[PDB]
Amino acid sequence: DKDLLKGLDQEQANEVIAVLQMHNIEANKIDSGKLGYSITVAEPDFTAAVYWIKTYQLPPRPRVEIAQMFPADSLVSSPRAEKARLYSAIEQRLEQSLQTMEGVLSARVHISYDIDAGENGRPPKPVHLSALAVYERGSPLAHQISDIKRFLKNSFADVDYDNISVVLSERSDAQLQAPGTPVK
Amino acid sequence: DKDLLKGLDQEQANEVIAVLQMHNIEANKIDSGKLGYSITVAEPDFTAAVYWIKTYQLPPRPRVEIAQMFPADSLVSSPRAEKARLYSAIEQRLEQSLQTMEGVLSARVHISYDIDAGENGRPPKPVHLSALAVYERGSPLAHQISDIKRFLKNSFADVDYDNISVVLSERSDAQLQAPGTPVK
Amino acid sequence: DKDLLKGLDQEQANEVIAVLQMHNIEANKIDSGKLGYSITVAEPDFTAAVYWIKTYQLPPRPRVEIAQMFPADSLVSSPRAEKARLYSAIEQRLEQSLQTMEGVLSARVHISYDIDAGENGRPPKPVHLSALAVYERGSPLAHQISDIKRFLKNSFADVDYDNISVVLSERSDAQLQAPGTPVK
Amino acid sequence: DKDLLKGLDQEQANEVIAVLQMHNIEANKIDSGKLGYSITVAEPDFTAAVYWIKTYQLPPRPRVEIAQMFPADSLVSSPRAEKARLYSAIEQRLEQSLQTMEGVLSARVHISYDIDAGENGRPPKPVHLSALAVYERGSPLAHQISDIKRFLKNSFADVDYDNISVVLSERSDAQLQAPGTPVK
Amino acid sequence: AELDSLLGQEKERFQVLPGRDKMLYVAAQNERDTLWARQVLARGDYDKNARVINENEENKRISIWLDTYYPQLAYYRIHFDEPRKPVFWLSRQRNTMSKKELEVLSQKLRALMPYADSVNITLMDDVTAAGQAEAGLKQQALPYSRRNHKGGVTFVIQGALDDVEILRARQFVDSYYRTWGGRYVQFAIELKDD
């Protein structure tokens, strides 16, 4: 019955419980209205519960993307700002599209940004990409490394296959057991 | 009777149930008026229900398209903004048209964007495309990979067949069984 | 008696029923006044009804066309905006005209757009077209692929027959049986 | 029952307890409303508790990033400010993406900044990167030093593998024991 | 309530077969009618055991069985035009099985399918399987290229093709894959420019 986090949001609270239940301590999510959520664990498990907050850097800061810093509410805009807000929405759209392939669970894509491509008379340099993936297990993931590498090739102007690197792994082993209350 | 998500919208709630019913836990969708929906599962299945939220990154963030960041409500506009808002509506219209072919259930199309085509005296580079598809099963999907590749060829200025890559698969096996309440 | 969608519009509701009645579950359309419609299915069929919402991406987002993003209510206009609003109305008019041929039930036409045709001193490139069709069955649809290809040839400045690709199919087999209530 | 810190925030308080419980003294976190938290330790352990505040420089000052000093609320902006606010959000996004690889717990990425690249007629110099990581133990971390070094290569314009240096280690040994109250 | 009334209004698209392992099977003729009958057996308004077997899926089920116990067997396809007496097509020029163990092969395919009474194994000429695939392809006036090798033949169709030459292609492939199956001759529709 000892608090360790309070004032959390919704997705910040449903993941801390997924961390603590993986390491065999049982947590409770208590709603508190407009003040956000709060997480309390048992008193014999309070020492271990603080150590797995420091280690995983919990609670999660919200995920930051490039268009959040170049907002559309500005009165004026620059050609540097419109390009970095355009590539920031292609980059979000490609990871929305990798999640609908067979067996993919999550994905993150990165795009190389050109800032002084046309501002000093350079030709624009070639585009590079990189991707991550977390597959459902049982899949021969040595062979599905080429379908991502084919799908991402002709989604831009001119890339090569030696310029795309996708790094993928299988998901962790499932947690289906209740943790267990400390018997006193 | 333990909450795990609340404040959801309509399409964010009808998919989380489709996730949890696939993994043999039964969820309930409780309306709460103007505060959005909420999803509660049984108490023996609360551990497994949190693990399949962290894995699939649920609830789904809404799908982001290029025209949402270059709005028409601006007082001024640029030639960079009008081209990226035009290609963003051809890209939505092509995936509206792939869903009416025989056997297609969902599709996503991507277009390569030119930003300094005419701003520095370049000729405009060739257009590349890429597409996804989820077919109804039983279809010989080695042969329907050319009809998409023919339909997308002369929808633009000048593409080649080595510049269009469509990657498609069959849908997953159907879920028609009720999950089953935990007997206590 | 379990809801799965509410707040729908008219054409979004008459199609979800056409999806669910094809897969042998019976749905009911309940009007609710100014709040839109709502669809409820039986309680033994609730598991299958959620799976066919996730698969077909229901409810349908409204069909998007190019003139919806370049509105006529703007105070100023550009030559890039007037051309893309003109081709967007030829493209709607051609699919209104394919539906009145014999045996055609639905059609969708696409036009290739020129954006920097005259803005940098290029000659305007040749126009490409593409079309879809869903025929009434019993028709020899190997022979009616040339009448569409003749009708679309001289509707523009100068196209060739190797630049028009029409891809057509026959409609699906008819659903005329009542689904059947779950006997308990 | 002697105070040593008061007025702390939430994440400043859940880490000082993780420091003091690692060195076998037991601390208590007392909420005090809108005045922030406060940490009190036992009276025989007050000497050791002050020494581990001076050594680790506790409480933690909040983590400082480049975009906090070039805010978007300014009326005017410069090309020097927009580039250093763009690289500051790529740098945050790359460390959000390293935390979802298998076995990674925390990561920090740094980017080399160009300030007079185009302001005096230089060509822009090559981009350098550097990264840190804290792995879950049991992993052969001599082999996962190349997957980070492959993922970070084509996330920018043109880097080389002799320009990326990632330095990683395994996490410390776990603290799962209660410290123990001073018997008097 | 007998199962033939729990199905649709027409008692025509579904034919109900009594099994041998005290189970009662439902035979549908395409994939869309399989999900019609599997929805009934999944909501649970039938007290006994039942299945839904399909013409396409009962082929892929015992092709897994036959790829484990009897490898190196050259067969074509199993036809269910009457489901109580299925026909097992089998190649003639590529097997040396005698008269006696062909009866053993039939008496074990009977054990996989409890709805069948006997399996009629016939042997057909192997040259005519590649004969109808070529003579039917020259009739459609399509460009092609034959590549003979040991244990199979393949037909390669490339080049820039208008839709008259790939609509007639896909109607001939899907009507040939139904009859002979895709284990001896496989088509290659690759559409590239020149």
Add this chain to the structure above:
Amino acid sequence: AELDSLLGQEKERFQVLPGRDKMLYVAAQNERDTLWARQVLARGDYDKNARVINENEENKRISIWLDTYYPQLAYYRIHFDEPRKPVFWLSRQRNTMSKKELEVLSQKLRALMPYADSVNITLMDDVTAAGQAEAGLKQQALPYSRRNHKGGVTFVIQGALDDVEILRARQFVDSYYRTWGGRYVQFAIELKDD
């Protein structure tokens, strides 16, 4: 409550095997149905001991056992088409084990699997394992390159490839890895430009 009613509505996708060490096993046929049955045994609505064994995962479990006590053994894959009598494929041309200790190998694989009654060890020809991998690959009209060496063979597929030539590739790899396993011949789909 017997376990075959605690599972789904169809008593068809799951087959329940009585063990020998007073435990009761559940055999699922793919990975998605393994998480269906492991969710039941983890919420704890069964008073006795039970497991869920999978066709893929029961191979990787006793491949760890067989890589410790019997090294240098050339085997292919274990098939569970009927789970009470599994089939242990074994290479012929790369082992010199006599008649007597092949019985000892079977009587110790029986001890690892309490649900099985006997393990049928068969010996198959090693040349035909590389024969079906090549003759099936020329039928798909794919470019390749054979690299023979002692104790294994590999097929390298590089070059710029359109999606017709890598969709037919991945459907042939995954249907070949199910039958023969990836211990003797391993494919190399590397997609680079030129």
Add this chain to the structure above:
Amino acid sequence: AELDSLLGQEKERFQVLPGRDKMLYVAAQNERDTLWARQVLARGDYDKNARVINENEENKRISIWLDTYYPQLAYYRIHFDEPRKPVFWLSRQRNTMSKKELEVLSQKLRALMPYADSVNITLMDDVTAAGQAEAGLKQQALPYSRRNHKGGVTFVIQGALDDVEILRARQFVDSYYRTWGGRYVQFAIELKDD
């Protein structure tokens, strides 16, 4: 309360071994399940002495003991596939220990591990340890370079490598380090440009 009920719902992932020094050991099979069982013994809901031993960490514990009392000993790895009778692999061509003190080596490894009954020391051929590391590496089609010297061998892999050639690398390293250990042959994946 016996300890096998204080653990999780499945009494399957944990096997409880009675010791010899009046202590009761818990054997987990990976690192994530070690922190599951050490959390139970640390909150203190067990009145007696207990430990959690891991397959990886019980190797690194008595490798410290064996690097102090018996230096210059060429060994490979200790396998715990059944924990009551562990197997101590030992090199043949690099030691001159006679028959008698190999019994002395086994009777002192028994004293380090109170859960074991006897330690089975076996001698294996040293050439085949470098034989499977090379023949498994040519099968993955990777560039390499062998550097033989006295008392060990190393494989150097450099050059610009795409992800097909470093995903197949890291899956072969981690499956080889589990079997043979990293004391005789060590791999060198260094990724630089050219």
Add this chain to the structure above:
Amino acid sequence: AELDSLLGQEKERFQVLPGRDKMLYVAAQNERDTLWARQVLARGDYDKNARVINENEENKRISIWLDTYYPQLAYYRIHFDEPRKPVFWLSRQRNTMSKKELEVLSQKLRALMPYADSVNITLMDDVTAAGQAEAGLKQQALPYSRRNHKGGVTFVIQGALDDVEILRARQFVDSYYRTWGGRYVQFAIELKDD
């Protein structure tokens, strides 16, 4: 209250040794657990005299004693794998001490450590100390340079090095400094450009 209950929950990481000068010692195995046990003895909840001795710090304590009374002695390191009978490693080829005063050296190291019963002085071969440091260094594929001289050897490692070649370096240095100590051979990781 006996001291083994005033420590943590596990009575496993700390082993309590009865002394000989009416003091009671606590042996910890790393530096972090030394501050755990010294915090107990400093708040003063024990009525008798106690210490906390560490494996690293009990070496540096009597290396000061041995650098005053017995200079010019070539020794390596003292191991405490069992603390009641420590092992004093000693070089063979660099000392001319006879049989009798080696007993005198052991009977005075016993007087420094009241927790020990006897000190076992052994003599080891000096060439193999520089043998394992070089053969272990060629296995990691690192560039180096040997500089032999009288009374010691040193290994110089310079040049521009990526992190694969300095992560494998620092894992080999710290595992070698634990066994042999840094009195005969000392490594030189100097990282400069070229």
